[PDB]
């Protein structure tokens, strides 16, 4: 009967849900081909984030530091930016894009990033006359927002930089697609959907090849596939499809204001209805029919979920944490399969935006159970509520919440970022029809294993 938004009631954080803005800016940048982000700050701001990406993906990604040291903290760090850009350019001959990402240190000391970019542009034009390197200023102070906001800021700044340089050309006939912060498997699903619907689209950023092969020829293919050319062509698109309000919609709006490319923000496609509505929007903007192949994939997903919903899911209580577009989308998916998402945790200071999200209203009008949405949440909020008596049958969230579930003896499905404590999840779609099916089956299989380990009617797994 009531969906209530409330903030965390503590000033401090125990067990943060998200990383800081610069980490999200790094994630945006590593999806660009021939890009090495340069993180202007102390060394930990780079190295810890490279480790985080290795935890999620089990791969290396290249990011550099400006190595701020004590002298720059007293006199300013511009010379560290300028050196860092040239040392990148000189040692990586194919490098084309450097997002220059600020940190808490370099925001506090007020280094003039745009001034350093003018110096480096002059230096690079003189030293490498036949090269163009795009330097994008990315302002990501860590004392506001989160890696979610930092992702969105970097995407927007890179797009502004590159489209500023190339402007509007000939119509491409393509869609721009900003899926937000999703896995390689989600990108693979979207590419299939557009191919089956005969819709040309660029997916920003294209992270499919983050899951790179170990090849006979020892080649390294672990790269973003989105090129300068692909980003520049965004000016020429027929439309933008933005799937994530907090993860790239603001770039869709920028391209609408600058280049009159109409932006369509839709619910993030977690679950069946949200996928349906995404495909209807694609059909509306392109004039292309939804193919039979997607009716069939949808029907296969529904068939699978129907084996689970009333038998194993109905009336089971769920807590969900992760990025806001993921939390809100998964809550809607859960209700489609008769799960009851009673506790939604969103991890940053953007509550004044979340209060206006139309999906809150979609929950307030649908749910038959109270939902608490805690914004500015940490993961201690979850643990403390369980310790105070909250009864949960399932947790859905990323791997940094694992000990909460382990100790409480609650089954947990790993979703969102980072999912380092299970194998291969970055390759499994979560969005779309196949993604809904895969999520539902992870939920059931986690419950099934729990029933066996706890001897809770484990004999029932025979004739369902």
Partner 1 sequence: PMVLLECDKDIPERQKHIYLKAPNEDTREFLPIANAATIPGTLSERGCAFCGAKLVIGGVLKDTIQMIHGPLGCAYDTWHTKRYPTDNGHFNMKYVWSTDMKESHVVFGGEKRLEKSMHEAFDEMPDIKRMIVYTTCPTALIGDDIKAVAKKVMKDRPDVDVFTVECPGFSGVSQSKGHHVLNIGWINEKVETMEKEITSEYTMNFIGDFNIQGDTQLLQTYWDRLGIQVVAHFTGNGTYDDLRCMHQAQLNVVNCARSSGYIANELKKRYGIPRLDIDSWGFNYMAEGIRKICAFFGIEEKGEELIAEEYAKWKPKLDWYKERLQGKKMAIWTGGPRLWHWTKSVEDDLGVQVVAMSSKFGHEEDFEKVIARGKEGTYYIDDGNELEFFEIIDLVKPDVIFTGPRVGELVKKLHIPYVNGHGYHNGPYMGFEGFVNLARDMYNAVHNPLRHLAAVDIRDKSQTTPVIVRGAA
Q: From the annotation, which residues make up the binding site for [8Fe-7S] cluster? A: 20, 45, 104, 142
Q: Do 271 and 433 contact (CB within 8 A), yes or no?
A: no
Q: Note whether 200 binds Mg ion by CB under 5 A.
A: no
- For the bound state, the minimum distance from the C-beta of residue 321 to partner 1, rounded and expressed in Å, comes to 14
Q: Note whether 45 binds ligand CLF by CB under 6 A.
A: yes
241 bridge partner residues: 177, 264
Nearer to partner 1 by C-beta: 53 or 333?
53
- For the bound state, the minimum distance from the C-beta of residue 352 to partner 1, rounded and expressed in Å, comes to 14
For the chain, report the end-to-end CA distance as a whole number of angstroms.
31
Residue 426 and residue 186: Cα distance in Å, rounded? 8
Interacting residues with ligand CLF between 88 and 147 (CB under 6 A): 103-104, 142
- For the bound state, the minimum distance from the C-beta of residue 43 to ligand CLF, rounded and expressed in Å, comes to 6
- For the bound state, the minimum distance from the C-beta of residue 244 to ligand CLF, rounded and expressed in Å, comes to 22
Distance of CA 18 to the CA centre of its chain: 11
How many beta carbons lie within 10 A of that of residue 62, not counting itself? 15
Q: Note whether 41 binds ligand CLF by CB under 6 A.
A: yes
Contacts of 300 (CB under 8 A, 6+ apart): 433, 437
Write out the binding residues. Answer: 20, 45, 104, 142
Instruction: Give me Rg for the CA atoms of the chain.
Output: 23
Interacting residues with ligand CLF between 400 and 439 (CB under 6 A): none
- For the bound state, the minimum distance from the C-beta of residue 79 to partner 1, rounded and expressed in Å, comes to 9
- Among positions 24, 31, 42, 185, the unique one binding ligand CLF when judged by CB under 6 A: 42
Q: Do 33 and 227 contact (CB within 8 A), yes or no?
A: yes
Stretch that binds Mg ion, among 162-170, 236-244, 288-296, 303-311 (CB under 5 A): 303-311
Q: Note whether 306 binds Mg ion by CB under 5 A.
A: no
Q: DSSP string covering 339-370, please? A: -EEEEEE--SS-HHHHTT-HHHHHHHTT-SS-
Q: Note whether 224 binds ligand CLF by CB under 6 A.
A: no
Q: Is 271 helix (H, G, I), strand (E, B) or coil?
A: coil
Quick one: tokens of 150? 């930092």
10 binds, among Mg ion, ligand CLF, partner 1, none (CB under 5 to 8 A by kind): partner 1
Q: Which residues of the chain form contacts with Mg ion (CB under 5 A)? A: 303
Q: Which residues of the chain form contacts with ligand CLF (CB under 6 A)? A: 20, 22, 41-45, 48, 103-104, 142
């Amino acid at each position: 009967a009531e969906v209530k938004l409330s903030p965390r009631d503590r000033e401090g954080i125990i067990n943060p849900m998200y990383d800081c803005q610069p980490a999200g800016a790094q994630y945006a940048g590593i999806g660009i081909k021939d890009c090495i982000p340069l993180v202007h700050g102390g060394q930990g701001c780079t190295m810890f984030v490279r480790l985080l990406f290795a935890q999620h993906f089990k791969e290396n990604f290249d990011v550099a530091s400006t190595s701020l040291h004590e002298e720059s903290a007293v006199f300013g760090g511009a010379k560290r930016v300028e050196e860092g850009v040239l040392v990148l350019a000189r040692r990586y001959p194919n490098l084309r894009v450097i997002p220059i990402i600020t940190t808490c240190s370099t925001e506090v000391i007020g280094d003039d990033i745009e001034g350093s970019i003018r110096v480096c542009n002059r230096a690079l034009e003189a030293e490498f006359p036949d090269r163009k390197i795009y330097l994008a200023p990315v302002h990501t102070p860590s004392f506001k927002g989160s890696h979610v906001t930092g992702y969105a800021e970097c995407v927007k700044s890179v797009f502004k930089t590159i489209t500023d340089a190339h402007g509007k050309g000939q119509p491409s006939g393509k869609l721009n697609v900003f899926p937000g912060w999703v896995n390689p498997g989600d990108v693979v699903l979207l590419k299939r959907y557009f191919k089956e619907m005969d819709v040309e689209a660029n997916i920003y950023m294209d992270t499919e090849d983050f899951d790179s092969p170990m090849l006979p020829n020892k080649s390294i293919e672990t790269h973003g596939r989105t090129t300068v050319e692909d980003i520049a062509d965004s000016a020429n698109a027929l439309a933008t499809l933005s799937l994530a309000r907090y993860e790239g919609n603001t770039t869709g709006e920028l391209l609408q204001k600058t280049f009159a490319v109409p932006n369509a923000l839709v619910n993030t496609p977690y679950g069946i209805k949200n996928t349906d509505d995404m495909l209807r929007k694609i059909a509306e903007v392109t004039g292309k029919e939804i193919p039979e192949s997607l009716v069939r994939e949808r029907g296969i997903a529904l068939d699978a979920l129907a084996d689970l919903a009333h038998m194993f899911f109905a009336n089971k209580k769920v807590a969900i944490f992760g990025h806001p577009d993921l939390v809100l989308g998964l809550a809607q998916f859960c209700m489609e399969v008769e799960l009851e998402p009673v506790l939604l945790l969103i991890g940053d200071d953007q509550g004044n935006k979340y209060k206006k999200d139309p999906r809150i209203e979609e929950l307030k009008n649908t749910a038959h159970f109270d939902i608490e949405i805690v914004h500015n949440a940490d993961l201690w909020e979850l643990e403390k509520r369980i310790n105070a008596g909250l009864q949960l049958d399932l947790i859905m969230g990323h791997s940094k919440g694992r000990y909460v579930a382990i100790e409480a003896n609650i089954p947990m499905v790993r979703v969102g970022f980072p999912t380092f404590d299970r194998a291969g999840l970055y390759r499994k779609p979560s969005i779309g029809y196949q993604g809904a099916m895969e999520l539902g089956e992870m939920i059931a299989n986690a419950m099934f294993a729990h029933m066996e380990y706890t001897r809770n009617k484990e004999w029932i797994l025979n004739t369902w």
